[PDB]
Amino acid sequence: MENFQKVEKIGEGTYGVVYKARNKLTGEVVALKKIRTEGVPSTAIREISLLKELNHPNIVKLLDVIHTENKLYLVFEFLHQDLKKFMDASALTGIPLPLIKSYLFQLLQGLAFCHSHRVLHRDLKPQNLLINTEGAIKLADFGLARAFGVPVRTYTHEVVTLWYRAPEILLGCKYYSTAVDIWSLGCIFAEMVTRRALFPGDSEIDQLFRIFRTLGTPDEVVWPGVTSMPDYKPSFPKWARQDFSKVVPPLDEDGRSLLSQMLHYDPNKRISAKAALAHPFFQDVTKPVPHLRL
Numbered sequence: 569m570e571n572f573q574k575v576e577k578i579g580e581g582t583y584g585v586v587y588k589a590r591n592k593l594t595g596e597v598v599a600l601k602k603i604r605t606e607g608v609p610s611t612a613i614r615e616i617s618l619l620k621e622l623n624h625p626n627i628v629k630l631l632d633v634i635h636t637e638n639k640l641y642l643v644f645e646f647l648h649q650d651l652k653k654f655m656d657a658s659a660l661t662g663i664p665l666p667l668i669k670s671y672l673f674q675l676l677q678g679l680a681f682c683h684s685h686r687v688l689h690r691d692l693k694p695q696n697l698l699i700n701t702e703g704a705i706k707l708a709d710f711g712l713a714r715a716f717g718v719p720v721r722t723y724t725h726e727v728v729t730l731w732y733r734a735p736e737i738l739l740g741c742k743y744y745s746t747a748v749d750i751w752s753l754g755c756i757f758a759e760m761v762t763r764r765a766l767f768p769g770d771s772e773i774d775q776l777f778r779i780f781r782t783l784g785t786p787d788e789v790v791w792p793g794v795t796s797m798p799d800y801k802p803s804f805p806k807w808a809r810q811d812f813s814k815v816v817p818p819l820d821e822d823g824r825s826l827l828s829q830m831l832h833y834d835p836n837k838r839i840s841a842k843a844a845l846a847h848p849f850f851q852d853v854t855k856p857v858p859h860l861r862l
């Protein structure tokens with residue numbers, strides 16, 4: 569990197585390698601992502617470029633989109649840890665409820681902002697949620713999925729996780745709505761509470777069936793139009809819905825109520841980020857600081 573001294577390899581993203589780097593001129597420390605074949609789609613350039621204006625305190629800031637030497641680099645503000653690592657590290661005692669609530673509240677503010685500007689994430693997961701020592705949490709990679717697509721395998725053959733995928737996506741819908749992000753966030757909220765992934769599928773059908781086994785196989789009553797979806801099969805087994813009290817114990821009724829609205833099958837009935845922010849669950853929200861050992 570000409571203007572960047574590579575500090576460390578942060579990981580192998582969905583699109584390419586990500587490095588923590590230091591701008592040799594300003595000294596600012598950033599996250600530099602090298603995106604993957606030959607020519608760089610011009611449409612992706614314009615689209616990604618527009619994201620430079622999508623600024624909000626709970627959205628990882630896109631500092632620059634470098635299209636030089638016919639290669640694509642994205643420069644992002646740097647945060648020291650992601651939620652996946654934090655959850656793993658908090659697995660023995662669990663993340664305290666006040667912090668889970670603060671993070672969920674901040675994540676919803678972030679979604680509310682992007683959604684009002686017509687930008688969707690589409691692939692939210694704990695690894696895409698970044699946190700700092702101040703108690704803030706931010707969403708990373710908003711809008712990139714649209715600029716590219718679903719790779720199935722990152723770039724190093726790693727398997728892309730399906731655990732947070734909305735059911736309308738699994739059923740073949742071609743047009744995603746903002747509801748897909750609320751679904752993923754609901755799945756993450758449940759994982760923070762129980763300390764185990766809600767729907768850890770290892771194939772598209774296993775993912776769909778794990779959802780059906782917990783929330784019941786969807787039908788025309790709860791989801792008008794579901795039986796006409798591209799990948800819907802009348803042969804899907806019919807499972808009864810389980811009670812949330814059994815799905816995310818020992819979360820209280822305000823939390824179960826909100827989660828239930830974030831996991832509604834019908835994308836149109838699923839709660840919006842804006843409405844979720846007004847839910848009684850956030851009546852006593854605060855902003856605690858996490859125990860972060862960097």
Ligand SMILES: NC(=O)c1cc([N+](=O)[O-])c(NCCCC(=O)O)cc1NCc1cccnc1
Binds near residue numbers: 588598599644645698
């Ligand atoms: N913008 C960023 O600061 C950042 C970007 C990406 N990413 O662009 O991908 C990322 N990968 C998420 C890791 C995904 C994984 O392999 O599990 C993590 C980040 N920071 C948190 C962090 C975490 C660990 C070490 N150091 C910093």
